[PDB]
Design a protein around this ligand. Structure first.
Ligand SMILES: [Mg+2]
Lengths: 111, 240, 195, 243, 250, 241, 231, 235, 244
């Protein structure tokens, strides 16, 4: 039977300061007991001063980030180049994730 | 499917199909609505060109949409049935989802919306019907009376008439209806409604129908004899 | 939900339905009314899967109320029961069937007769002098088979119903928190507020 | 009357006037030609320079279908593009199912049936183009020309557009003087000459020459555009003949 | 593309006429004469095989068609319209009856189905009415022998005897004088041949006349033996020789 | 007067668009002829290549519909090829569904039914073509069946189509009035082709070279067209007696 | 005349009148200019107001970081076509990780417009577009007509009185094509070009709209005090 | 007849141009934008004295920060309002914020040209959409059935529009107070109306950042009418 | 395109009338007269066949009177083919109701349903309306004996006595004159035949030109019987009432 999910490992960490924020992640990518890559970027600059990481199944992770980056692009087109605030980005990502409620993106997302 | 745009603008900015639908309303039998202090009365004309009619079974002009709201009309009879059915379905749908019966304004807004939709949808013609919608909101004792027309515009009225010779009975109502003091009782309201129809009807026999709606789902249709007593008293005061 | 009982006497139909609503571990409510008035002289009690019961009952209620307004006429209990049966028979071969069992108690104003109909979720309809759904019949039918007479008064029907509930409260493992009892006769529907 | 107001209506003659009106749009277009040579085909077209602001060599008119078929047309340019897009879908589905690239006669009928279908209903307009096309397949070289009616035949040489009469006369001379045949390189030279000669019907504005070819020996049976030195050589040969 | 004619092409004119139906009836009037006569023990339907060319093999063109083993049909008007109606009539006899009840439809109900198809071409979007009038003869157990006419409007009527097409007015008068309720099938065939001769100009023989009957069961035409209840079709098309034999006793 | 634009009845019960489609049939100015032998069915058609720039091998109005069925068309080539593609598709589908080769008369009926639909449905126009189907049927033997824009069809002993059909028709009629049989009493198809060409020459009053004609022959289990050199051999035999 | 009731009807001379009428809507529109060098491509557009209380209708729309257009005619039609270009540019980036070539963008616009000229029920687009962009083959300028005809040019103008700007660019051809690595001078040439189409009115601070794209320059639109420098 | 999506020889859509004529027959609506807020006012125009005028609803709330006034075939506006309300609420659901006034207006205008042989004809009503957002402050837009929308400092639509617009040309300046705008709408409405202006046949409304969209009471408007009368008699 | 050929069957005139409905009513005025009369103990349906022939098989013929179920029947005036389409739909509706509620469909509910179908063809779809007017004769246990009519507009009304088809003006005046409320079926049979005899365009009223039916509680006890009269039975009632 075909299993549409996998586990690419990885660990990410976000911390909010008083006037700053950091989003960190290791660069190792794996399946089972093998290393796929020692350097595969996992935390991405998505524009509008927002950084994102979707950790877990890397295919779903890449797909989600790609769709959010796209959502930022279309937010600019549709709303006169308005800056997407972090709270608005967060609500938007909820809808991206819940859209696949019954076939979920197998990831833990942090922005 | 048949998609042809039948309702369209003309060079002078008129939609003729909607305007011609109003001409069908002008042809229909006269309908009148008057609201008192604690009631609303709906009067309707019955053309006496049709005798040998079975009045038990013939479709009555006033229709209950729910236990607390009624609808009368002027225009195409067949068209009115479609609006009445839709209104009745929506009334039950509202009770089912909101757990409260429709307000008179809401029911009016729905019917008016259906009428509007049929003025800019492909392959359909407008309804040749204007309606008078009357009743009382749930747990409210303030009388309600609304009017709709083929274009889909609607509004509230202290008193209103539609159909043939409605220009005449509106003339009567405008000089006889006082806003500061509306018909205080059922008697006064029915009397003013019968009086308004007598300006247009012909014989006061089986040509006038009267339906009284009071608060808390109290709706009753007057009989021939009861109306005949109003007809009698009105003319005996007139002989002076 | 759990216990629903019905008995047709001389001049009325009596429906008794339990008050408890249990969600697994806890009893969330002890005053739940498992019934809907379909028309002035017709009452329907119900039991089955959570959510579907109330959804089905209210759907039926809406349809009968729609018919009543359209025709300015109350359908006979027989006609209402046939409509309900068809809806359940349709439902059993659907994608997700209504898991709902009902009793329909009505007074026919034309025939001047009380009528009780038992319908399960498959659309199995029977007209009965007394009926039940679930395990309720297993405890109560032997008492009803013994004492029931077709010429019983409403008061005698209530007394026989009390004996049935007492037997249920004795031998049933579940606490159903008593019953709400309603009477359907020529004057309409009323609730017995002390039982 | 009124028979010419609607497509697919037969006139009392048995004519489809809307199709005949589409031909008028074709006759209004620039001149395009096709020459069948020994082991392939050559296509050429006249491009009117409306203004100095047009970027030279950029507004390409000749179109490739698959990798072995060339298409050129005169009339409404967008209509021609629509026809080539369909042709590309037809060629793709043929190759998908049957593996081999679509034969030229097979491809000809696919375009033919599609153009003919736009003469069957009043809800569509006929194509305002005549299309010259062809290439090399397993049975050799093929040249076709397709009209707004859907009518097409095989050709030794073909011409359409405003200067078609001039071009046809030049093509007929080549057929008579070369019964044994014409080489691919000769056909490119001759194609340049014929377009230059046909430009007399469009003499007001100056033009840009565009040539393409498919040849078994010269291009390995693939469609290619004539560029650089070989194009200049053909322009020089053409300019020498008009003087 | 798409069929964008979703509106009626047949409509009421100010005088209450349905133009396209009237015009369809005019096309029927121009058609070659066909007739039907009902006897006590059978029904006969007949028409002329108006051959368009002598090089044409008129035997390959069937104007009289079997619909079911006990029901046959003939027409006057547009031949192609008739041919497609025969195809639809044969199919609807199976889909809306035989596949449900396991038996062939009675004459009146098959006629009703054909009538419905013709009615719909008079109201549906983007179509014209059928330019034919049909005469349908048949037998069934409970109704016995029957003969029906179906017009372009979809209207149908039962007849003792009738004619449609070119010389129908004269032919119907001829049939009124000869018809009675005691006719045997052979008498009806004789009257059919007499009536048809009046409307025919040229050759009048078995090769130019098409004639079929609904009569006795033909076990010889069943194609199998062994089932007592199955006794064969009642529809039989007369041969060229069989027609000529009855033209000597004419 | 929109009753002349679409296929609805005129006050005379006529369909003008159908009548005008019959007129489009003669737009090519080509005449065709079909005859039956003992074992074969022959169809001949005039071939005219008016432009020297044309490839004459691609100019044809005879089509190989199936292995057994051939079709000659009288009318414009776009409508001709439309009918040809559909007939080929229908014949192939028939074999797949019913397990045997589609008969010539059955294909003719099917295409005639399709044509009938265009005369009744408004959105579809009639095809301006007459279709003559030929074969040697396994049940009926040599067969000629012809379809027109009205949706009419019938079998033929022999037939002719085109601007000068009447001259050819009468010529054929007179021959069969003499012989009193429904076919050409000849063993070989070669001589049946020679008969067909000879009687077209007589009827039209014109001589033919090898490039002026187009010939199709149907035998048991195959239909084929003759090359120019095969036709030349036919023309030589005609001239030598 | 009798042949202009719909887009599905040729005239006896082979003309499509509904398409020609759609072309007429562009001529009523306000003037806009396009021109390019080998490093940059520039759009200049004269915006039109309803009255003195009203704003000036925007003329330039961004399609991607490397592509955008200016409009003349029915503005809602430009919104539809620019939205389609945004999607196509986006499809190319998401699926192929590839910036859409300006020439291919022109081909797509041609085909989309063509379908509205050959079918019943629809109508042609009533707007003209000038598309500029910088891709893997350098700077580009395209002119779109709703007939479907798309043309690659060094410079051009569309709208009312566009002939004056077009003649100026035809004279200046040899000069402005050589303006490489100097954005300000290329815009100056465009502002001088659009000035040849003005009558009665002149270029003010809320009147003028400028856009530029180039080698190391994302597609950016200048309005308000950002264009005062060029007035 | 002729297509519903047909162009005229001048390059204009027949149906769009004809709908503009229907809007000219509509009752007057006026909007004035200031740095303290945007004011919206309408002529009610009751057809009879028995018609209860407070049931005439020509000024409508779209969201807390966006209001709207209408003129023309007002029944056509209902589906436009429904779409606007849905768009405003939907954007808040997707983005946890208020929608920009321009973006709301653009969404409404996307419906306009969705007609053909979709709805069978264009809308026969024009809208004045007023609101506030953080990026562009107080704004007023004019949404037409052509699909075009212009931003305005002040705008009048309906039967008395060109006379009112000329008046707005002279009176508007960038320093107007909210109170000054209220009186100005009342003044110009009174000028173009057939009947004498009072609190029952005219209606005022405004949108401020603090309080949001508010339809004025008849008692509140009556005071502003009395204030207007006195200041006009003051010179 | 196709718009050119569209008659637009569902539009108002400037006067607010539906063209096609009005023209369909004109068609119906040339159809054979049908009469319905309601009495206290039953209903009568009488109708005239249109100019017949001696070779028409009458005993198997039906063009006017149709059975919808055991309690309800209709008289037809207009296009027979159109009527049969609607009649089959009505028969199905009656059975749908019987299956759903296990009770016979009330007369008005069936009438309203058919009338709504007619209405739809006047408001949407772009198709021509049905050129048919019905007289409905029926019984149910709510209202008892009932007469209704419907026409191509989809409007329906109830009647004590009514006519449709040709000469309705003359027929209605004659019915209005002689009808009384306490009338019985046997009297109503006579009135119907007398009215047809005076209004007919034929020279004389004979059995072969008539279709006749009664709905009576003259069914043994508490039930209703439909009687479609045979040709010989129409001949007898013509002699009994003294018309032939
Ligand atoms: Mg056709």
């Amino acid at each position: 039977q075909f299993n549409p999910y996998g586990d690419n490992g990885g660990t990410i960490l976000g911390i909010a300061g008083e006037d700053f924020a950091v989003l960190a992640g290791d660069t190792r990518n794996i399946t089972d007991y093998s290393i796929n890559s020692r350097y595969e970027p996992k935390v991405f600059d998505c524009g509008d001063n927002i950084v994102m990481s979707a950790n877990g199944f890397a295919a779903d992770g890449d797909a989600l980030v790609k769709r959010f980056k796209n959502s930022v692009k279309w937010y600019h087109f549709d709303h006169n180049d308005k800056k997407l605030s972090i709270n608005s980005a967060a609500r938007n990502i909820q809808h991206l994730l819940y859209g696949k409620r019954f076939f979920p993106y197998y990831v833990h997302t942090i922005i | 499917g048949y998609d042809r745009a039948l309702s369209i603008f003309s060079p002078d900015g008129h939609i003729f199909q909607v305007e011609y639908a109003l001409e069908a309303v002008k042809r229909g039998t006269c309908a009148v609505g008057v609201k008192g202090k604690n009631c609303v009365v709906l009067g309707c004309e019955r053309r006496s060109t049709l005798k040998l009619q079975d009045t038990r079974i013939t479709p009555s002009k006033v229709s209950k949409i729910d236990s607390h709201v009624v609808l009368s009309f002027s225009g195409l009879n067949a068209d009115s049935r479609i609006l009445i059915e839709k209104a009745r379905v929506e009334a039950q749908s509202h009770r089912l989802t909101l757990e409260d019966p429709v307000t008179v304004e809401y029911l009016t807004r729905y019917v008016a919306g259906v009428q509007q939709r049929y003025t800019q949808s492909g392959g359909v013609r407008p309804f040749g019907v204007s309606t008078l919608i009357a009743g009382f909101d749930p747990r409210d004792d303030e009388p309600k009376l609304y009017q709709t027309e083929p274009s889909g515009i609607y509004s509230s009225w202290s008193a209103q008439t539609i159909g043939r010779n409605s220009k005449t009975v509106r003339e009567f109502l405008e000089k006889n209806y006082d806003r500061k003091e509306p018909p205080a009782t059922v008697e006064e309201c029915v009397k003013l409604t019968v009086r308004s129809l007598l300006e247009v009807v012909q014989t006061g026999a089986k040509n006038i129908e009267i339906t009284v709606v009071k608060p808390d789902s109290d709706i009753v249709a007057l009989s021939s004899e009861e109306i005949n007593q109003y007809v009698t008293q009105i003319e005996q005061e007139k002989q002076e | 939900m759990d216990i629903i009982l019905g008995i047709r006497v001389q001049d009325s139909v009596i429906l008794a339905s339990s008050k408890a609503v249990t969600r697994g571990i806890s009893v969330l409510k002890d005053s739940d009314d498992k019934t809907r008035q379909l028309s002035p002289h017709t009452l329907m009690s119900f039991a089955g899967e959570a959510g579907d019961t109330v959804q089905f009952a209210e759907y039926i209620q809406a349809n009968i109320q729609l018919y009543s307004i359209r025709e300015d006429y109350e359908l006979s209990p027989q006609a209402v029961s046939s409509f309900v049966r068809q809806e359940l028979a349709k439902s059993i071969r659907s994608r997700r069937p209504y898991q709902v069992n009902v009793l329909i108690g009505g007074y026919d104003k034309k025939k001047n007769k009380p009528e009780l109909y038992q319908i399960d979720y498959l659309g199995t309809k029977v007209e009965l002098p007394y009926g039940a759904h679930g395990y309720s019949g297993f405890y109560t039918f032997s008492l009803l088979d013994h004492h029931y007479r077709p010429d019983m008064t409403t008061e005698e029907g209530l007394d026989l119903l009390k004996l049935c509930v007492q037997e249920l409260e004795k031998r049933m493992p579940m606490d159903f928190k008593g019953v709400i009892v309603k009477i359907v006769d020529k004057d309409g529907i009323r609730q017995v507020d002390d039982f | 009357t009124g028979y010419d107001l609607s497509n697919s209506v037969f006139s009392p003659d048995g004519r489809n006037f809307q199709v005949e009106y589409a031909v008028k749009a074709v006759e209004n277009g620039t001149t395009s030609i096709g020459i069948k040579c020994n082991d392939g085909v050559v296509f050429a077209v006249e491009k009117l320079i409306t203004s100095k602001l047009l970027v030279p060599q950029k507004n390409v008119k000749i179109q490739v279908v698959d990798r072995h078929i060339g298409c050129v047309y005169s009339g409404l340019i967008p209509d021609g593009r629509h026809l080539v897009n369909r042709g590309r879908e037809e060629a793709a589905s043929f190759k998908k199912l049957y593996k081999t690239p679509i034969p030229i006669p097979a491809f000809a009928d696919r375009l033919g049936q599609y153009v003919q279908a736009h003469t069957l209903y009043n809800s569509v307009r006929p194509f305002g183009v005549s299309t010259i096309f062809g290439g090399v397949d397993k049975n050799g070289a093929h040249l076709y020309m397709l009209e707004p009616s859907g009518s097409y035949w095989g050709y030794k040489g073909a011409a359409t557009g405003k200067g078609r009469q001039s071009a046809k006369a030049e093509l007929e001379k080549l057929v008579d003087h070369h019964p044994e045949g014409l080489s691919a390189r000769e056909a490119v030279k001759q194609a340049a000459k014929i377009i230059y000669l046909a430009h007399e019907d469009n003499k007001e504005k100056d033009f840009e020459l565009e040539i393409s070819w498919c040849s078994l020996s010269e291009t390995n049976g693939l469609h290619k555009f004539v560029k650089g030195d070989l194009l200049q050589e053909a322009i020089d040969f053409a300019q020498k003949e008009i003087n | 593309m798409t069929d964008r004619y979703s509106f009626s092409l047949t409509t009421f004119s100010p005088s209450g006429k349905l133009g396209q139906i009237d015009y369809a009836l005019t096309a029927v009037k121009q058609g070659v004469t066909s007739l039907g006569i009902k006897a006590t023990n059978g029904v006969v339907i007949a028409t002329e095989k108006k051959s368009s060319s002598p090089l044409a093999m008129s035997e390959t063109l069937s104007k009289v068609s079997l619909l079911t083993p006990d029901i046959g049909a003939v027409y006057s008007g547009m031949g192609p319209d008739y041919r497609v109606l025969v195809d639809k009539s044969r199919k609807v006899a199976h889909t809306s009856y035989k596949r449900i009840y396991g038996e062939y439809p009675p004459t009146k109900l098959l006629v009703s189905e054909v009538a419905k198809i013709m009615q719909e071409a008079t109201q549906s979007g983007g179509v014209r009415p059928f330019g034919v009038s049909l005469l349908i003869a048949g037998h069934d157990e409970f109704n016995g022998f029957s003969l029906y006419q179906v017009d372009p409007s979809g209207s149908y009527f039962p007849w003792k005897a009738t004619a449609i097409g070119k010389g129908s007015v004269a032919a119907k008068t001829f049939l009124e004088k000869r018809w009675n309720d005691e006719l045997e099938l052979e008498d009806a065939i004789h009257i059919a041949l007499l009536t048809l001769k009046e409307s025919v100009e040229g050759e009048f023989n078995g090769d130019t006349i098409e004639l079929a009957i609904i009569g006795d069961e033909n076990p010889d035409l069943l194609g199998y033996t062994g089932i007592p209840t199955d006794k064969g079709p009642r529809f039989r098309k007369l041969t060229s020789q069989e027609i000529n034999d009855r033209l000597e006793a004419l | 007067g929109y009753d002349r634009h679409i296929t609805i009845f005129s006050p005379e019960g006529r369909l003008y668009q159908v009548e005008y489609a019959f007129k489009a049939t003669n737009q090519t100015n080509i005449n065709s002829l079909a005859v039956r032998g003992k074992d074969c069915t022959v169809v001949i058609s005039q071939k005219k290549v008016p432009d020297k720039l044309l490839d004459p091998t691609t100019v044809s109005y005879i089509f190989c519909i199936s292995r057994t069925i051939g079709m000659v068309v009288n009318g414009p080539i776009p409508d001709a090829r439309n009918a040809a593609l559909r007939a080929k598709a229908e014949a192939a589908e028939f074999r797949y569904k019913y397990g045997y080769d589609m008969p010539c008369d059955v294909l003719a009926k099917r295409m005639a039914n399709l044509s009938q639909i265009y005369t009744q449905r408004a959105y579809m126009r009639p095809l301006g073509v007459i279709l003559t189907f030929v074969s040697v049927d396994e049940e009926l033997g040599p067969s000629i069946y012809k379809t027109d824009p009205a949706g009419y069809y019938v079998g033929y002993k022999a037939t002719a189509t085109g601007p000068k059909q009447q001259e050819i028709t009468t010529n054929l009629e007179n021959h069969f009035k003499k012989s009193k049989i429904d076919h050409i009493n000849e063993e070989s198809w070669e001589k049946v082709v020679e008969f067909a060409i000879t009687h077209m020459i007589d009827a039209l009053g014109t001589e033919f070279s090898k490039n002026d004609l187009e010939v199709g022959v149907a035998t048991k289990d195959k239909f084929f067209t003759l090359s120019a050199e095969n036709i030349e051999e036919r023309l030589v035999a005609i001239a030598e007696q | 005349n009798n042949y202009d009731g719909d887009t599905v009807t040729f005239s006896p001379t082979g003309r499509l009148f509904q398409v020609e009428y759609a072309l007429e809507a562009i001529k009523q529109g306000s003037v806009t200019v396009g021109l390019r060098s080998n490093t940059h491509a520039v759009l200049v557009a004269l915006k039109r107001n309803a009255d003195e209380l009203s704003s000036y209708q925007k003329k330039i729309i961004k399609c991607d970081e490397h592509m955008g257009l200016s409009l003349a005619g029915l503005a809602p039609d430009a919104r539809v076509l620019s939205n389609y270009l945004r999607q196509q540019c986006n499809y190319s980036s998401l699926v192929f990780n590839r910036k859409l070539a300006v020439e291919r963008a022109g081909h797509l616009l041609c085909d989309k417009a063509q379908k509205n000229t050959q079918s019943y029920g629809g109508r042609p687009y009533g707007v003209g577009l000038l598309i500029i962009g910088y891709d893997k083959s350098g700077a580009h300028l395209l002119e779109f007509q709703p007939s479907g005809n798309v043309t690659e040019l060094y410079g051009t103008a569309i709208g009312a009185r566009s002939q004056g700007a077009k003649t100026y660019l035809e004279r200046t051809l040899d000069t402005f094509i050589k303006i490489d690595g100097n954005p300000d001078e290329l815009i100056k040439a465009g502002v001088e070009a659009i000035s040849q189409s003005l009558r009665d009115e002149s270029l003010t601070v809320d009147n003028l709209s400028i856009a530029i794209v180039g080698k190391d320059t994302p597609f950016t639109i200048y309005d308000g005090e950002a264009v005062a420098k060029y007035i | 007849d002729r297509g519903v999506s047909t162009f005229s020889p001048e390059g204009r859509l027949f149906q769009v141009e004809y709908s503009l004529e229907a809007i000219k027959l509509g009752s007057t609506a006026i909007g004035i934008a200031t740095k303290e807020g945007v004011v919206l006012g309408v002529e009610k125009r009751a057809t009879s004295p028995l018609l209860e005028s407070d049931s005439i609803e020509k000024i409508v709330e779209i969201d807390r920060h966006i209001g709207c006034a209408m003129s023309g075939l007002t029944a056509d506006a209902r589906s436009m309002i429904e779409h606007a309300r849905t768009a405003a609420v939907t954007h808040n659901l997707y983005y946890d914020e208020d929608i920009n006034v321009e973006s709301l207006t653009q969404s409404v205008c996307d419906l306009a040209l969705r007609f053909g042989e979709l709805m069978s004809r264009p809308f026969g009503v024009a809208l004045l959409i007023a609101g506030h957002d953080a990026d562009d402050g107080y704004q007023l837009f004019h949404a037409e059935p052509s699909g075009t929308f212009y931003r305005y400092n002040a705008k009048a639509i309906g039967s008395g529009s060109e006379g009112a617009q000329a008046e707005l040309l002279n009176e508007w300046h960038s320093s107007l107070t909210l109170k000054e705008a209220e009186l100005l709408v009342l003044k110009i409405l009174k000028q173009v109306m057939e009947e004498k202006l009072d609190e029952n046949n005219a209606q005022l409304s405004c949108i401020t950042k603090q309080d949001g969209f508010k339809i004025y009471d008849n008692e509140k408007t009556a005071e502003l009418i009395k204030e207007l009368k006195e200041k006009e008699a003051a010179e | 395109g196709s718009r050119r050929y569209d008659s637009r069957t569902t539009i108002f005139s400037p006067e607010g009338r539906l063209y096609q409905v009005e023209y369909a009513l004109e068609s119906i005025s040339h159809a054979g007269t049908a009469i319905g009369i309601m009495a206290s103990d039953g209903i009568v349906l009488a109708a005239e066949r249109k100019v017949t022939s001696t070779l028409l098989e009458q005993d198997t013929s039906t063009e006017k009177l149709y059975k919808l179920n055991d309690k309800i029947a209709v008289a037809v005036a207009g296009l027979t083919a159109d009527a049969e389409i609607l009649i089959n739909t009505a028969r199905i509706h009656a059975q749908n109701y019987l299956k759903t509620y296990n009770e016979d469909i009330p007369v008005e509910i069936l009438v309203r349903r058919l009338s709504d179908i007619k209405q739809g063809y006047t408001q949407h779809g772009g198709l021509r309306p049905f050129g048919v007017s019905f007289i409905y004769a029926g019984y149910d246990d709510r209202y008892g004996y009932q007469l209704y009519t419907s026409n191509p507009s989809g409007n329906y009304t109830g009647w004590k006595a009514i006519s449709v088809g040709a000469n309705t003006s003359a027929a209605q005046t004659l019915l209005q004159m002689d009808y009384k409320d306490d009338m019985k079926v046997d009297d109503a049979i006579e009135l119907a035949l007398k009215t047809l005899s005076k209004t007919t365009d034929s020279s004389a009223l004979t059995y072969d030109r008539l279709e006749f039916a009664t709905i009576r509680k003259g069914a043994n006890d508490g039930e209703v019987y439909q009687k479609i009269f045979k040709p010989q039975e129409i001949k007898d009632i013509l002699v009994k009432t003294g018309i032939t």
